[PDB]
């Protein structure tokens, strides 16, 4: 309607560093005029899949608020983002609700985030006591005891560090390169809309 401000999509897609999967950052988009053409302007998108709305009709809708979640994950796990899936990345790091509506985008990024012998500054959880409810973030890294015997101090026999590190090299085959993932979430038409495309009111 009255407002006219371009949304900061280029502040997310053209970002330099993406955080680790266990501590993904959520960015709120509001009070701007959306434009979903420059989003599709990039051709080599590995996956661009929308669940609730259809992508071709995203230019005439008003959203109550937009949320963007960005991270990097292995290729073999890129299919563990759709709702209702299970595994070791959708059970302990990032879970989506069953009635989720929005669009997910993912593309290969081996040209940037890889190192000559591996990158050890990307982490992911491997050990936890229970599955997490949707859209829940965990940061604590307490020593996780596995056996009946209580643990303390340092790790070791049956005492494991609940985190692990990746290793990205330009030598692995397809399925191990670091794939960058951005997920959009939004609700439709129940409140004064802050994000809207060009209108014909």
């Amino acid at each position, epitope marked *: 309607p009255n407002i006219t401000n371009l949304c900061p999509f280029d502040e997310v897609f053209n970002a*330099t560093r993406f955080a680790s999967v266990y501590a993904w950052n959520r960015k709120r988009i509001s009070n701007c005029v959306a434009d979903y053409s420059v989003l599709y302007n990039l051709a080599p998108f590995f996956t661009f899949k929308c669940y609730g709305v259809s992508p071709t009709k995203l230019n005439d809708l008003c959203f109550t608020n937009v949320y963007a979640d960005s991270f990097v994950i292995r290729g073999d796990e890129v299919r563990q983002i759709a709702p209702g899936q299970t595994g070791n990345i959708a059970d302990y790091n990032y879970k989506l609700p069953d009635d989720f509506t929005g669009c997910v985008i993912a593309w290969n990024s081996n040209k*940037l985030d*890889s*190192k*000559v*012998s591996g990158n050890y500054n990307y982490l992911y959880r491997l050990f936890r006591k229970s599955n997490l409810k949707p859209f829940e973030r965990d940061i604590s890294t307490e020593i996780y005891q596995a056996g009946n015997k209580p643990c303390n101090g340092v790790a070791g026999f049956n005492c494991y560090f609940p985190l692990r590190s990746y290793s990205f090299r*330009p*030598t692995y085959g397809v399925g191990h390169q670091p794939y960058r993932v951005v997920v959009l979430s939004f609700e439709l038409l129940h409140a004064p809309a802050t994000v809207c495309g060009p209108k014909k009111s």
Partner: antibody
Amino acid sequence: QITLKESGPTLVKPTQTLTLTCNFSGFSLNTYGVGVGWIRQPPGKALEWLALIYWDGDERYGPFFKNKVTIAKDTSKNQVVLTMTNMDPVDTATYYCARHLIPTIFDYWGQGTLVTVSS
Amino acid sequence: SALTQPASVSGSPGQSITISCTGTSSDVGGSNYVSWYQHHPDRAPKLLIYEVTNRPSGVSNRFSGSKSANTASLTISGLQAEDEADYYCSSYTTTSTHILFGGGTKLTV
């Protein structure tokens, strides 16, 4: 303009430790992705890879000279420093400093300098 | 090293010639990011091939590349005296991040 330059000695004693420096003009090492590597070539044979340095303090040395070489950076002065020990007469070679990227292994090779080991 | 290259190949000017670089299935095999440089006598090396059949700006489209089961090959068409220099092949290896290719000096008649 993007230029690479090298600075160091020419006559090094076997007991001494070789030191060499490279200056780069046209970008900064702090940028996400760019690295700087060192290449030596002994006369009569091919070139060789010594070491490389990344933006966030990641170090990768040659598999056979882990305990002898050591490199460091100074982005406030746009310099990179290489130090090697236990000179031997076979180490006579021409040295180069070059840019490093993940897709393209080496892009901008410097002019380099020839160094010899003798009395 | 476990990586070699033929010593020298000479070809007549104005005719297509190809110089090949060889490796092993384990270290390089079917990897990617192969590269090819040329080194002139007393001049800094410059990049000519950085990806398979790919060249950066300042194109010299006559040069071409090819990758076979365990080798690579660069083809030059229309040779000149300027082409007379050393040619280095290059690739990633699993055991170490090195190239160490001997390089074959080009000759013209």
